[PDB]
Amino acid sequence: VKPNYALKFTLAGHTKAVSSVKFSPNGEWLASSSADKLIKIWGAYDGKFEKTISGHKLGISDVAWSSDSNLLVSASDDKTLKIWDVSSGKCLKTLKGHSNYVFCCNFNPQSNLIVSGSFDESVRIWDVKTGKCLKTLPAHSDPVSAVHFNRDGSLIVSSSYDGLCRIWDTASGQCLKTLNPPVSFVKFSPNGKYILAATLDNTLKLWDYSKGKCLKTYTGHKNEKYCIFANFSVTGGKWIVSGSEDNLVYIWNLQTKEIVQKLQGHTDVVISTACHPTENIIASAALENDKTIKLWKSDC
Ligand SMILES: OCc1c[nH]c(CCCc2ccccc2)n1
Ligand SMILES: [Cl-]
């Protein structure tokens, strides 16, 4: 069985490169971040523009939702993160402490913590309520490309241009495991047993966290320059989804590693993809020659 993702909506509005798209956990919204210093909120199902959220002084590299879909966090070149009330569009907290661009961010499942990764080579853990930095992890020896909490928030996985993926005990900040090309993206599988890692040699790899071994390798896409998001699609067939520097969305069969679909339409690097939490829907977003978000729907 292969998916049949077809274009449903093109979301225009950003005036520079889109950096990240994420579906709200309740499935209602897509959030987009951009080099244009803005967050935009869109209807997940009708693609309808809802609102612009502004306040960062420089471009945004990443955005992430709280578990209840009420808050966003953004990571910016202004060296801050901002926590946003999505309903009001208001900045609740500015998280200050990184000494260079903040590149990546995520809430834990409880959504009492935010993890961030920075060009300053550190991973920070922040208290959402106070906006204060709880821990600074001397995580890497080059810019941090991705940070992600596992299913219960007990672990953080980080990746870096230093070629390392590290797994951190959230509660203590201690490194549990180091899992040489630059690692441009990492995240835990929904069940937290696997880590998906991108390297800037046109390769995605599925790792068994507990055993520390590579189970699957996905190739055929172009990825030598940008930190391109990748996803587990789990609503229908079990796919791996990624953007690509050849302007396509790549979908692989997770088990067989065969490319099952390439989605055409973007006119620049597909930097970010997201999979809808309940429906067979993909969001894709592209760099500055395109600047659009596309919503795609499949029957499986
Ligand atoms: O965790 C992987 C990750 C986070 N953010 C990105 C996108 C980087 C590209 C980009 C940056 C700033 C403006 C426009 C585009 N990848
Ligand atoms: Cl996620």
Residue numbers in the entry: 31 to 209, 214 to 334
Recite the paper's sentences.
A “cellular multitasker” with many binding partners, the scaffolding protein WDR5 is best studied in the context of histone methylation as part of the SET1/MLL (mixed-lineage leukemia) complexes. WDR5 comprises a 7-bladed β-propeller fold, each blade composed of a four-stranded antiparallel β-sheet (the WD40 motif). Cavities on each face, namely, the “WDR5-binding motif” (WBM) and “WDR5-interacting” (WIN) sites, are the interfaces key to its scaffolding role. The WIN site is dominated by a conserved arginine pocket, where the guanidine headgroup sits in a “phenylalanine clamp” composed of Phe133 and Phe263.
